[PDB]
């Protein structure tokens, strides 16, 4: 029945409401109902690591360091570069048992460099046998060694004091990997290097490092009681690598090129797959449209910030006030 | 809300207005009506859209960082690595909490404000031709057809043309 | 305050109201009166109570951390430990400063808002039966005994029953 | 603004008022006028001046710190040094962004508030002797010379002396 | 005189005020008076360390490390666990003068473990005398040694090259403490170990550490010019501890159990007493009802956050506006 | 034409506007025009380092360490103190080629101390020649050595085992700089020190450090194939410095006074000049009236906080609304 308004009319103001709103928090109230809210925390991973848009290298069975040293089962990585190198828990070494003082630092340095490509240099080793091998480091079926290292031994009945140079006449820092052999017994020491005690001194104009080997049995891994200790030196442009040894030197074959890199390494066990993402986590890639992130504090790329909270609801509408 | 409009002198929202965020209902010589208000709706939406983008800068490309999880015990320098990451995360967690709460406060405050401004805008056009009925409505003391109401909704009401009729009817 | 009620058009607060945060005084045919307003009082209290708890999460159990004070000089890694703790503390100090100031702003803004909403709520019931006297009071143009005043305080005033008397008295 | 005064029911600001932040224009029996309002102007200025100083504590004397830039590659502990400084800087950058935005919001909100309070202050003195014209002006229904206007600007207008004249003229 | 209201009444709105309010700060004003405020900074300590609710262990005269090594005057700690270990400034060693490279790291590791309980293992030392003693380390009145270490010496005219194993066939990391003896003179070296120069090599599959002793006089402390250097090794489940020595070995008797612990250590000189608290500081326990804290940046438990400011006042009422 | 107002008047409220306002950002809008804004970020340096109000020491050709060691071309710094020491990229060593393990730490320690003033102590070196020299370290035209170090050599055909003490009976920590000589060949080793292998052990009650030299050629710098390795020891009040050596000792002449200092060191290549500032950056001094700062993250003094943003505009007026 209409209309009523003979000499009058009424005009009411109002706003919309929805049947079922959602609770958000403000400074004034713990919980208040609004028409619409948006989630600010990314809690779901994609479940996989996306092959795009970054260049992802799956280590599979190799650590970054083993691939860099040139462990036989890591020969397929020898010409490889990456933005992000994935290390699997599954990884294992399968060459001569070794250790590296400040391993993490070296791993960090190579990871940043984003490459394991190697440049051979014409090092000259007078009075010594080169390319020493070991049954603990099979290459195919024949026994071998780390492709980037050069196991030097006596030639005949002689091991003379090597003193070798290598200038850096290029515009970048050269990274040299080298090491020492710790023989399991004195029979082996004198059989391999003649002298009862070895030493190695690698130096430049600005720095030096001297290492003495410790002869003695360590626990057996891959048939070997002996060890190799790995060290490194960074030769600056215009500086010169010097190497001095009366025995036990595990020599470099060349250098790696250090470059300011936006590359890194990440421990993860999720598969890599065909998809696109700009942020990567040990749980997989994650979307980055949201500004916050509760999947993992370990990230790489354009990543939302990691926070403790699992959900944060941003109001995108007014307070919802349905009848009554 | 600090303006006391939404869940205040406007008793409730209207589910049957799917046409906008704010609007009008009315009763007049040509029947009853409803109409959304675009100006107010857009004013509120424009403040809500891209709100975070005013404070949070574009997602920043981060590359090689520190280890944050560890296989073996080491001591001193591992304690420092953990404590740095723990500190970082607690600070950003705090920031995120603070931001959402004051951002939501602002959303609720601003949407109540638009409801109030629309009521005040309407009151000001009507001048002495209408009275506040105390519930978000105005009694208009003259005959006001759909074109008349539209002039109010559209900001074109000329109160002078109705003034004398309004006064005649207003005191009985 | 942005509403201009507290230390504004209400000249001062009342010490003799120990009964609530907001209320009424009045003068009528049965004498003078005072009465607290519970609704408004509780609305303000509820926003003030547990305010920090909305932003600051529950005190978090922290165990083994780093050294923060040192017996001897060491250099590099001690500089880093100190700088990390110094950085942490300056950031939380800033947060604490910011939080209290904007939290207090909000308290002052919200308590002024409730004073304003109560005045507006009262104005809206009275309609044309009263006038704003410019000082936070209304002149009511009809006889209003204690029950009448109570209906206003309680949101039950029906202005229609008094309308004609109010108009009779209002223009002289 | 949430009060809808500046760029709201006041259509625009006045360039020809170099004398203050807020003020009056008027038309009366002695001609047209303009006058700044000091009270409101100072109330706003006093809130704007030293705003940062309420939140940011005095510049703090900092001496020996860590290295933040490096000549050679080192690895682990250099990664941590960089990450600490990077973390610090991103947190203060965020703080700075947040602070300016909410500080500016507050400035805009508070200056609109003063414009509104001045209109409300003026409305309250005038009582039923004037009407809101819907544009930030009042029609005053009596003869009001420069002294009369000054009493309004200065908070001294006594509406009772003009009341009867105002009513005579107000209903035609 | 009443009532006035014949055809009218007046109704005024208002708010309360108190006689004496309190100044707080806002974004708008440096100081503004409010009816009531609450303090947000805890500046008062309890003055004591509460025995509840955490398990507090007072070191009294012992450092955490000495108790762990087994210094005689620390025998009462040998079966002890804690959530928080209190070290007093008063503490002192009273055994053989020693040092520990990266002492802080070890202290940190044991502190986290929250226990000093020791598990003996059946190590076998062929060709050497065990349980060496010293007048610098009295146990009661008889002279003794660190209870957790085993000072090995020549038997007869012989000190053979010891090579001892100890596998970790348990599901947790074992922490081994061991060391080396630095004799003050060559008379002592050969009298104790026969060989003119000693060495010790402790290894596992993944790691090794070799230490050589330096013979020579150090400053006298507790009658001793010689020293013992202390080191440690963490043996992972499935790995094996190997020890090799031709002299100067200060041998372990067993291991400590490493566990992910919410335990720590704290330097303090306030007494422990009967009371309850969930937060502990070098100044004592502090209440934690407030969210901020200016007592000390060193804390343990459920602690308010430390900040520079000594007071922060939160308004819990409206602006106070008394007459006039 | 006037005035109009016979029985009426109108009174309008308003606010000011300016012809040309400026854009700021708020929580509500990306850009909004205001009457006036103020810049919060300092992006301009002064271009120079101000001689006031801090005490600035220009290293010119010297590193902080060389000045501390007493390199001849750094003799003018020997009595110097500073609040801030400026190191130039231009700097170079011109004495015997050396290295320092944890160089940065030492540099950091001396920088904090804010002084290079040295206190000679009456060390007694029986059976050895003192004040050894080198053509690689010219002082004037005559050849010399680091003024703070004492190169000890054999006297006649003898180099006896030195064991020297020096108690710290003062109320502060003493910092001792010392080192070792690494000869380039065994001819030189035995010619200088007689014994085929040297060693140096510096100790106190609480600590010890032993160093062995490595004989062998390093790359030539300033005519020298040999090296000196520099180390340091901090002797606490009531402790005692002990030094023991059968050869290769580069001895201290005394100590430096460690003090809790508000001094530091800064790498920079801008000139120092006459002006006043309370904040210093590698780009020069900067004003500190603003609270934020985008010039450099490296600062010293009362400095605005460094942030990523290059500009941040604070509104200091209302929204600007000109006609129309
Ligand atoms: C110092 O003491 C150490 C502890 O006894 C000695 O180390 C041990 O040295 C012997 C050989 O000298 C090794 O014995 C060999 O073990 C390998 C491998 O184990 C076999 O069994 C496992 C079962 O799990 C199986 O998986 C393998 O495939 C093998 O079938 C055998 O191939 C040899 O025949 C022989 O038994 C010990 O393994 C080794 N243990 C450790 C922990 O290193 C060390 O020789 C001593 N050095 C001295 C006195 O100078
Ligand atoms: C991102 O990847 C992460 C890596 O897997 C996922 O987090 C892991 O979730 C698993 C399964 O629930 C948890 O594994 C459990 O560990 C606890 C032992 O507690 C210790 O870990 C906590 C961390 O929460 C740490 O604070 C303490 O040191 C504890 O001692 C066992 O009780 C269970 O049996 C089980 O092994 C891990 O806690 C957690 N990993 C890490 C590194 O924190 C995570 O779920 C992934 N993201 C998403 C969205 O799923
Ligand atoms: C290298 O030079 C070092 C410096 O001279 C030599 O060290 C000194 O060695 C002698 C013994 O060879 C010690 O002398 C003994 O001191 C103890 C303790 O001191 C007494 O007096 C104090 C007073 O404060 C009192 O408190 C004590 O209870 C003792 O009564 C006496 O017990 C002995 O009788 C004797 O005097 C020096 O103490 C010691 N000094 C330091 C700093 O080590 C070292 O022997 C030399 N080594 C060589 C040449 O190979
Ligand atoms: C929590 O326990 C703390 C540990 O005692 C208490 O703080 C200590 O208060 C004492 C007594 O006032 C202060 O001792 C003084 O030290 C100064 C030297 O200044 C150096 O210390 C400052 C720290 O403020 C540092 O920034 C610089 O390195 C300074 O060089 C002497 O002038 C005095 O003679 C006296 O020895 C300590 O400053 C302070 N200790 C620490 C570690 O900061 C604190 O009071 C306790 N909490 C409460 C609520 O009382
Ligand atoms: C180990 O092998 C090393 C590599 O060959 C040997 O090092 C070299 O040793 C010889 C002397 O034994 C040095 O030759 C001298 O060089 C200096 C300086 O160079 C001159 O030319 C430059 C041009 O840039 C000029 O600027 C200078 O002013 C000089 O005019 C000359 O003064 C000598 O006459 C002589 O030529 C090498 O410099 C040096 N090289 C390095 C990198 O150290 C080392 O001797 C071998 N050690 C052994 C076998 O025990
Ligand atoms: C404060 O002093 C600073 C020190 O000089 C000034 O900043 C420097 O500005 C110069 C000149 O533009 C830049 O030098 C360039 O370096 C880049 C290489 O990029 C690398 O540097 C960036 C830092 O931006 C870093 O993130 C990456 O590692 C990059 O690999 C070359 O492309 C150019 O050819 C040129 O050499 C420096 O980038 C920058 N120095 C530093 C340490 O960041 C600064 O301008 C001064 N303040 C003011 C207000 O002027
Ligand atoms: C409630 O609020 C939410 C969020 O504010 C609204 O839903 C979301 O609307 C946005 C755009 O307004 C959608 O954004 C997407 O962004 C990506 C970025 O590249 C773009 O590629 C997509 O095409 C899309 O625009 C988002 O998908 C959408 N989410 C959902 C779940 O609907 C929504 O409009 C609001 N609801 C109501 C009833 O108003
Ligand atoms: C002024 O504001 C303060 C604080 O907002 C009020 O005083 C405090 O009131 C709280 C509860 O409202 C008391 O809290 C205590 O908390 C512990 C937590 O477990 C509980 O166990 C205690 O039983 C107690 O509830 C606190 O004691 C109290 N403090 C003081 C000094 O009185 C106060 O109500 C306000 N004053 C006025 C006049 O409104
Ligand atoms: C627009 O706002 C700005 C800043 O809020 C105003 O300009 C600035 O005014 C301040 C003082 O109000 C001046 O501060 C200076 O501080 C140092 C500190 O020691 C003092 O020594 C100086 O004597 C001076 O007071 C500052 O110089 C000035 N800057 C500029 C560029 O003018 C300005 O008043 C506002 N403009 C308008 C039209 O309102
Ligand atoms: C909106 O929310 C309401 C309340 O939670 C929902 O109403 C009910 O729906 C469930 C399952 O669909 C029924 O079991 C209940 O009986 C309903 N509520 C009542 C009070 O009877 C409603 O489903 C939601 N709106 C949707 C799904 O559109
Ligand atoms: C409230 O504050 C006022 C002002 O500080 C106090 O008033 C005085 O009290 C002191 C000591 O009790 C006297 O010496 C002064 O003479 C008083 N003021 C004046 C202006 O004369 C008052 O004590 C406080 N309220 C209390 C304690 O309840
Ligand atoms: C205020 O801003 C305006 C608009 O940017 C300026 O107006 C002009 O000035 C430029 C150069 O002086 C001229 O080329 C333009 O033709 C002008 N604008 C228009 C629309 O014609 C003005 O200069 C600024 N105010 C000043 C400098 O006081
Ligand atoms: C309402 O006013 C109109 C004027 O046109 C007229 O119909 C009458 O006066 C009033 N009511 C009814 C029901 O007719
Ligand atoms: C007030 O009104 C009442 C009406 O009942 C009446 O007493 C008279 O008109 C007025 N005043 C006085 C003093 O009587
Ligand atoms: C305006 O009012 C005045 C009263 O003094 C008188 O002049 C007349 O009534 C009105 N207008 C004009 C133009 O005279």
In the structure encoding, which two tokens stand for residue A251, read together?
Answer: 């020599």
CA dihedral defined by D120, D126, D130, D131, rounded to 10 degrees? 20
Q: Which of F34, F108, F312 is facing D100, going by the closest CB pair?
A: F312
Neighboring chains of A (3 or more beta-carbon pairs < 8 A): B, C, D, E, F
Task: Judge whether C131 and C140 are in contact, CB under 8 Å.
Answer: no
Indicate which ligand has the atom closest to the C-alpha of F19. 12
DSSP code string of F77-106: GTT-B-SEEEEPTT----SS-EE-TTHHHH
CB burial of residue B118 (10 Å; 0-12, 13-18, 19+): buried
Dist. CA A269–CA A60, nearest whole Å: 9
Nearest to E193 by CA among E220, E155, E242, E221: E155
Closest CA to F87 of F107, F70, F71: F107
Give the Cβ contact number of residue F58 at 10 Å.
18
Angle between helices D76-126 and C76-126 (to 10 degrees): 20
User: Of A261, A268, A254, whose CA–CA distance to A57 is shortest?
Assistant: A268
| DSSP conformational letter for D129 | G
CA angle, D150 then D155 then D160, to 5°: 90
d(CA D122, CA F13): 9
Both tokens assigned to F229: 């390795």
Closest CA to ligand 12's atom 1: F20
Task: Look at the block and give the residue holding tokens 């208000």.
Answer: B37
Q: Is the CB of E296 inside a 6 Å radius of any atom of ligand 4?
A: yes
Q: In what order do the strands lie in the sheet with E41-42?
A: E41-42, E292-293, E305-306
**Helical axes B76-126 vs B146-153, angle rounded to 10°:** 140
Per CB-CB distance under 8 Å, the chain D contacts of A236 are 72
Determine which residue's CA is closest to atom 10 belonging to ligand 1: A220
3-state secondary structure of E222: coil
Could C107 and E315 be called an inter-chain contact, meaning their C-beta atoms sit closer than 8 Å?
Answer: yes
CA distances from F5 to B164, D136, D139, D157, F8 (A): 22, 19, 10, 18, 5
Greatest CA separation found in chain B? Answer: 92
As a whole number of angstroms, the distance between CA E26 and CA D55 comes to 9
Task: Find the helix or strand (DSSP H, E) in which E103 lies.
Answer: helix E103-113
Instruction: Give me D152's structure tokens.
Output: 């309004």
Method: X-ray
Neighbouring C-beta atoms of residue D114, cutoff 10 Å: 27
| Contact predicate E280/E50, CB 8 Å | yes
Cα three-residue angle E34-E35-E39, rounded to 5 degrees: 75
Q: Which of F11, E304, E254, A181 is nearest to C61 (CA)?
A: E304
Whole-angstrom distance, CA of residue F4 vs CA of residue F1: 9
Q: Let me know if C72 is exposed, middle or buried by CB neighbors in 10 A (0-12, 13-18, 19+).
A: exposed
Could you give the C-alpha distances from F213 to E38, E221, F133, F181, F220, in angstroms and in order? 67, 29, 19, 7, 18
- Contact (CB, 8 A) for F71 and F145: no
Residue D15's SS3 state is coil
Report CB contact under 8 Å: E28, D47.
yes
The whole-angstrom distance between residue F128's C-alpha and the CA centroid of its chain comes to 35
Lining ligand 5 with CB less than 6 A are A 163, 165, 240; F 217, 219-220
- Long-range contacts from A151-154, C-beta under 8 angstroms, 24+ separation: A151/A181, A151/A250, A151/A251, A152/A125, A152/A128, A152/A245, A152/A249, A152/A250, A152/A251, A153/A128, A153/A129, A153/A192, A153/A193, A154/A128, A154/A129, A154/A192, A154/A193, A154/A194
Measured between CB atoms, does A102 come within 8 Å of chain D? yes
Q: Which residues contact F44 (CB under 8 A, 6 or more apart)?
A: F286, F287, F295
DSSP conformation letters of A4-48: --SS-EEEEEEEB--SS-EEE--SS-S-EEES-EEE-EE----SS
How much distance in Å is there from the Cα of E4 to the middle of ligand 14? 9
CB F179 within 8 A of CB F229: yes
Cα three-residue angle A185-E192-E145, rounded to 5 degrees: 110
Distance CA E249, CA E176 (A): 14
d(CA A266, CA A303): 15
Query: Vertex A260, ends A258 and A261: CA angle to 5°?
Result: 100
The Cα F152–Cα D134 span in angstroms is: 99
Q: Tell me the DSSP string of F111-173.
A: HHHTB--EEE-----TTEE----EEEEEETTEEE--TTEEE-EEBTTB---EEEEEE--SSSP
* Cα dihedral: A19, A25, A30, A33 (round 10): -10
Q: Which residue has the tokens 């200088």?
A: F192
- Phi-psi map region of F140: left, alpha, beta (phi>0 left; psi -120 to 50 alpha): left
The number of CA neighbours under 13 Å toward the Cβ of C10 is: 33
Say how far apart CA B107 and CA B122 lie, in whole Å.
23
Give the Cα separation of B101 and B110 in Å (integer). 14
Question: Please, what's the largest Cα pairwise distance for chain F?
Answer: 126
Structural domains present in chain D: 1-172 (3.90.20.10)
Nearest residue on chain C to B5, judged by CA atoms?
Answer: C117
Q: In this complex, which chains have at least 3 CB pairs below 8 Å with chain C?
A: A, B, D, E, F
Contacts of A15 in chain B (CB under 8 A): 6, 10, 13-14, 17, 21-23, 111, 115
CA distance to partner chain B, nearest, from residue A96 (Å): 22
Say yes or no: CB of residue F323 within 6 Å of ligand 9.
no
- Which among D41, C113, D104, E300 has a CA at the least distance from the CA of B2? C113
Contacts of E28 in chain D (CB under 8 A): 47, 106, 110
**In what side-by-side order are the strands of the sheet with F84-87?**
F56-58, F84-87, F264-267
Helix axes B38-48, B76-126, angle to 10 degrees: 170
> How far apart are the CA of F265 and the nearest CA of chain E, in angstroms?
27
DSSP codes, B101-129: HHHHHHHHHHHHHHHHHHHHHHHHHHGGG
* Radius of gyration in angstroms for the set of CA atoms belonging to chain B, rounded to a whole number: 27
Strand E41-42 versus strand E292-293 pairing type: parallel
Which tokens belong to E51?
Answer: 């025995």
Taking only Cα atoms into account, the Rg of chain E, rounded to an integer number of angstroms, comes to 31
Chain F positions touching C72 (Cβ under 8 A) are 173, 234, 236
Q: Are E268 and E166 in contact (CB under 8 A)?
A: no
Q: Distance, CA C14 to ligand 8 centroid (Å)?
A: 23
Contacts 24+ apart (CB under 8 A), F156-159: F157/F194, F158/F127, F158/F194, F159/F127, F159/F128, F159/F193, F159/F194, F159/F195, F159/F246, F159/F247
Please give the Cα distance from D161 to D158 (Å, whole number). Answer: 6
Between chains, do E208 and A97 touch, taking CB under 8 Å as contact? no
Q: What is the 3-state secondary structure (H, E, C) of B128-152?
A: HHEEECCCCEEEECCCCCHHHHHHH
Would you give the DSSP letter of residue B159?
G
The encoded tokens of residue F248 equal: 């290769």
The neighbour count for residue E224, using CB atoms within 10 Å, is 19
DSSP assignment of F276-314? E-SEEETTEE---SSSEE-S-S--EEE-PEE-S-S--EE
Find all residues with CB under 8 Å of C28, minimum gap 6, and list them. Answer: C143, C144, C145, C146, C148, C149, E3, E5, E9, E10
Radius of gyration of chain A (CA): 31
3-class DSSP state for residue F273?
A: strand
Which positions ≥6 away from E245 have C-beta within 8 Å?
E152, E161, E162, E198, E199, E200, E201
CA distances from C52 to A226, A300, C102, D77, E150 (A): 62, 34, 11, 38, 57
C-alpha to C-alpha distance for A288 and A46, rounded to whole angstroms: 11
Q: Tell me if A164 sits within 8 A of A155, measured CB to CB.
A: no
Q: In Å, what is the CA distance from A142 to each residue of A136, A137, B119, E36, E321?
A: 11, 9, 90, 86, 95
Phi then psi for A65, rounded to 5 degrees? -70, -45
Query: Rounded to an integer, what distance in angstroms lies between the CA atom of residue E136 and that of residue E133?
Result: 9
All residues of chain E having their beta carbon less than 8 Å from the beta carbon of residue D48 are: none
* Contact state of D47 with E25 under an 8 Å Cβ cutoff: no
CB D62 within 8 A of CB F84: no
Secondary structure (DSSP) of chain C: -TT-TBTTTB---BTT--S-SEEEEEEETTEEEEEE-HHHHHHHHHHHTTHHHHHS----EE-S----S-SS---HHHHHHHHHHHHHHHHHHHHHHHHHHHHHHHHHHHHHHHHHHHHHHHHHHHGGGEEE-SSSEEEESS---HHHHHHHHTT---GGGTHHHHHHHH--
Distances (CA, A) of E62 to E65, E74, E90, E115: 8, 6, 8, 14
Please give the distance, rounded to the nearest whole angstrom, from the Cα atom of residue C165 to the centre of ligand 13.
Answer: 25
**Does the distance separating the beta carbons of A216 and E201 come in below 8 Å?**
yes
Let me know: does E298 contact C87? Beta carbons within 8 Å.
Answer: no
Q: Which residues pair with A153 in a beta bridge?
A: A129
Does residue F295 have its Cβ closer than 6 Å to ligand 6? yes
What the block records as the tokens of B146 is: 């759909």
Question: Alpha carbon of C168 to those of B130, C160, C171: distances in Å?
Answer: 20, 14, 7
CA dist E286 and E276 (Å) reads 10
In whole angstroms, what separates CA E218 from the centre of its chain? Answer: 28
Chain E residues whose beta carbon lies within 8 Å of the beta carbon of residue D50? 30
F249 touches F67 (CB < 8 A): no
Contact B146/F at CB under 8 A? no
How many other CB atoms are found less than 10 A from the CB of residue D60?
11
Ligand 5 centre to CA of F225 (Å) is 9
Mutate to test the pocket of ligand 4, among E267, E268, E296 (most ligand atoms within 8 A of CB): E296
Cα E242–chain centre separation:
29
Q: Does A102 touch chain C (CB under 8 A)?
A: no
Q: Which pair of structure tokens corresponds to residue F179?
A: 């080192």
Element (H, E) at E301: strand E300-302
DSSP H helices, A194-308, are: none
> Any bridge partners for residue A217, and if so which?
none
Specify the long-range contacts of residues A87-91, CB closer than 8 Å, at least 24 apart. Answer: A87/A59, A87/A63, A87/A265, A87/A266, A87/A267, A87/A268, A88/A58, A88/A59, A88/A60, A88/A61, A88/A268, A88/A269, A89/A267, A89/A269, A90/A60, A90/A61, A90/A269, A91/A59, A91/A60, A91/A61, A91/A62, A91/A63, A91/A66
List the resolution, Å: 2.5
Give how far Cα E253 sits from Cα of D17, E120, E234, E256, F280, Å.
91, 6, 15, 10, 58
Q: Specify whether the backbone of F300 is left (phi greater than 0), alpha (psi in -120 to 50) or beta.
A: beta
Q: Is E185 helix (H, G, I), strand (E, B) or coil?
A: coil
- What contacts F1, CB < 8 A, 6 or more positions away? none
């Amino acid at each position: 029945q209409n209309p009523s308004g003979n000499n009058t009319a009424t005009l009411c103001l109002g706003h919309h409401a929805v049947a079922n709103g959602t609770l958000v928090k403000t400074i004034s109230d713990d919980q208040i109902e609004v028409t619409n809210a948006t989630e600010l925390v990314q809690s779901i991973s994609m479940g996989k690591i996306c092959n795009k848009s970054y260049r992802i290298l799956d280590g599979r069975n190799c650590t970054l360091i083993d691939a860099m040293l040139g462990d036989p089962h890591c020969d397929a990585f020898q010409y490889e570069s990456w933005d992000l190198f994935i290390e699997r828990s599954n990884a294992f070494s399968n060459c001569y048992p070794y250790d590296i003082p400040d391993y993490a630092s070296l791993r960090s340095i190579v990871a940043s460099s984003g490459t394991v490509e190697f440049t051979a240099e014409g090092f000259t080793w007078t009075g010594v046998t080169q390319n020493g091998r070991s049954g603990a480091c099979k290459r195919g079926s024949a026994d071998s060694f780390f492709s980037r290292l050069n196991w030097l031994t006596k030639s005949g009945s002689s091991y003379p004091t090597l003193n070798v140079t290598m200038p850096n006449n290029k515009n970048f820092d050269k990274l040299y990997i080298w090491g020492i052999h710790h023989p399991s017994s004195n029979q082996e020491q004198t059989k391999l290097y003649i002298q009862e005690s070895g030493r190695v001194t690698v130096s430049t104009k600005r720095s030096q490092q001297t290492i003495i080997p410790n002869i003695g049995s360590r626990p057996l891994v891959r048939g070997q009681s002996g060890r190799i200790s790995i060290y490194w030196t960074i030769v600056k442009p215009g500086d010169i690598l010097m190497i001095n040894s009366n025995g036990n030197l595990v020599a470099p074959r060349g250098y790696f090129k250090l470059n300011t890199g936006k590359s890194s390494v990440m421990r993860s066990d999720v598969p890599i797959d065909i998809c696109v993402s700009e942020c990567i986590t040990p749980n997989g890639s994650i979307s980055n449209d949201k500004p916050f992130q509760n999947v993992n504090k370990v990230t790489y790329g354009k990543c939302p910030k990691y926070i403790r909270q699992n959900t944060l609801k941003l109001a995108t509408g007014m307070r919802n006030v349905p009848e009554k | 809300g600090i303006f006391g409009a939404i869940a205040g002198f406007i008793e409730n929202g209207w589910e049957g207005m799917v046409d906008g965020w704010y609007g009008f209902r009315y009763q007049n010589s040509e029947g009853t009506g409803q109409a959304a208000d675009l100006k107010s709706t857009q004013a509120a939406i424009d403040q809500i859209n891209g709100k975070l983008n005013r404070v949070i800068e574009r997602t920043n490309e981060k590359f090689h960082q520190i280890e944050k999880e560890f296989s073996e015990v080491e001591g001193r320098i591992q304690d420092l690595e953990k404590y740095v990451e723990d500190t970082k995360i607690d600070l950003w967690s705090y920031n995120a909490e603070l931001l959402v709460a004051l951002e939501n406060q602002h959303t609720i405050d601003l949407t109540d404000a638009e409801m109030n401004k629309l009521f005040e805008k309407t009151r000001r056009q009507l001048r002495e031709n209408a009275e506040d009925m105390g519930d978000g409505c105005f009694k208009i003391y003259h005959k006001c057809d759909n074109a008349c109401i539209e002039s109010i909704r559209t900001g074109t009401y000329d109160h002078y043309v109705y003034r004398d009729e309004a006064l005649n009817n207003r005191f009985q």
